[PDB]
Design a protein around this ligand. Structure first.
Ligand code: AR6
Ligand code: AR6
Lengths: 153, 153
């Protein structure tokens, strides 16, 4: 059983026996390749004080399933729509939070609409920039880069 | 500036303007392959109520750098030691936490020592089991699987 220390906007903090638990809405992330470039985004993230390289990602809000949330954040963050395929999911850090991320591939991208910086970048270059200390990754950004190298070359 | 709502054992909860921020110690994770099997671990994770497929992972404690923490958790969780190479890092979920994970590759594993279940499993099978809904991934488990498919075949 959980006792709640804080009920917030995008998280709750609970204690469960000796365990500190952060409840958090699920998330989605979209991997998209065009002309050899992957679709990254960057935004200032106050939790870390910097703008890591991410792929388009967002929270699943009331009413939505993961596919719908993925289509929405792709459009809102980048102005694009595409044909989305579910790939896999992961718990971001299951030792303390229940946040689960559902990852999609987007193909056949179309601009549907003309704080978030869109960064098209070859994944090989993202990985080299990271290795040289020039940019940080989020989990979603790293998953995109690794998925590309595994399956999209 | 941050105001603290909770100072805990493995996290602090702060507000920063409108932002809810979870401070958390950094983590490490180790990717290890032997005879075509990757070294996974499973443990009950109360935050999610299940035991996802992870790779050996742990927190960096006072006094330690990432390499040292990685060697320690590999030994404590699996009884193994190896030659460790730094690969890359990622922020697990930078929209709300500062947790950063440093990922290593381990080679030339040796048993140094005879709650945590050690699960050697071919990564192709881990990914198929996940696709069929049979097991969940942590971020570290998924990163291990993707890294293998990208670079270790
Ligand atoms: N929710 C918690 N609340 C209280 N203490 C905890 C909790 N979980 C663990 N402990 C204590 O904290 C001690 C040290 O934890 P270590 O074992 O090095 O790490 P890890 O395997 O848990 O987490 C490693 C990563 O894997 C996952 O993605 C995680 O979220 C991390 O990102 C433990 O001995 C526990 O006593
Ligand atoms: N720390 C926070 N505290 C308060 N509200 C917040 C915070 N961060 C965002 N908001 C609000 O929450 C609203 C909805 O958030 P959406 O934009 O769909 O998601 P995302 O891109 O932030 O996070 C997506 C994932 O990427 C990362 O890995 C994250 O940690 C997630 O795992 C926002 O409009 C903000 O107003």
């Amino acid at each position: 059983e959980r006792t709640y220390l804080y009920r917030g906007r995008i998280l709750n903090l609970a204690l469960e026996g000796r365990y500190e638990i952060v409840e958090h809405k699920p998330a989605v992330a979209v991997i998209a390749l065009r002309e050899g470039r992957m679709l990254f985004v960057r935004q200032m993230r106050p939790a870390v004080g910097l703008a890591p390289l991410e792929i388009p990602a967002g929270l699943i809000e009331p009413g939505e399933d993961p596919l719908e949330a993925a289509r929405r954040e792709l459009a809102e963050e980048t102005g694009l729509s595409g044909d989305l395929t579910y790939l896999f999911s992961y718990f971001v850090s299951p030792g303390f939070t229940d946040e689960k991320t559902h990852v999609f591939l987007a193909e056949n991208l179309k601009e549907v609409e003309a704080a978030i910086e869109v960064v098209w970048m070859r994944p090989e270059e993202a990985l080299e920039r990271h290795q040289r200390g020039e940019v940080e990754f989020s989990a979603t950004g790293l998953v995109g880069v690794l998925y590309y190298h595994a399956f999209l070359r």
